[PDB]
Design brief:
Helix content of chain A: under 10%
Order of helices and strands of chain A: EEEEEHEEEEHEEEEE
Number of strands of chain A: 14
Structural class of chain B: mainly beta
Oligomer: heterodimer
Protein name (chain B): Histone H3-7
Largest interface: A-B, 17 and 6 residues
Strand content of chain B: 25-35%
Strand content of chain A: over 45%
Largest sheet of chain A: 5 strands, antiparallel
Number of strands of chain B: 1
Strand order of the largest sheet of chain A: 4-3-2-1-5
Subcellular location (chain B): Nucleus; Chromosome
Family (chain B): Belongs to the histone H3 family.
Structural class of chain A: mainly beta
Keywords (chain A): Acetylation, Cell cycle, Chromatin regulator, Developmental protein, Isopeptide bond, Meiosis, Nucleus, Phosphoprotein, Repeat, Ubl conjugation, Wnt signaling pathway
GO cellular component, one term (chain A): cytosol
CATH architecture of chain A: Trefoil
Radius of gyration of chain B: 7 Å
Number of helices of chain B: 0
Distance between the termini of chain B: 19 Å
Chain lengths: 199, 8
Amino acid sequence: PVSQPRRNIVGCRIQHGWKEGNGPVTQWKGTVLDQVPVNPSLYLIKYDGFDCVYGLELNKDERVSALEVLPDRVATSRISDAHLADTMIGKAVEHMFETEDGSKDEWRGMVLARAPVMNTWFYITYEKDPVLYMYQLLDDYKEGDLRIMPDSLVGKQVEYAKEDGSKRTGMVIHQVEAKPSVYFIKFDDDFHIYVYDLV
Amino acid sequence: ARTKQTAR
């Protein structure tokens, strides 16, 4: 029942090709943030240039090619405003973005956690787009683009009714510490991490 | 402010 002993790659910088279904190989470079306890094949990765956190079975997915774990070391970045950061956690927020034409575009959301590994970054999700995002929110805050407002189900299966008249099954993979009724869900055949209040 | 990525 043996398997090749591997270095734990959480915290590592990686790069790899990805075989698009009936398409070209695309190239990806990112940071491994986490290895999911209930499914150790599954990693959460923040890719450079992509706002969404993705979940991939990096060593198992046959679409991954030329996976390279880099020696590049992620900086042990001390937190500038530990106080401000710590208090944003679990808070509802109004997060200001910019449109194509530069017009304002405000999104209601919730700050979930400081991200592991890239710890000047934050986990955040949105009321109108409930997947896991990741930004350096202290920057948005300082620039006035982030306004703050005043048992575990992990391991269980959930079914969601797809808007295109269909159903799918996911696993509850993580409980948000600051808000224990909020969980991360991973569905098969979807790379996004869904964030739902399960109470 | 940040630019929203329309695809993801």
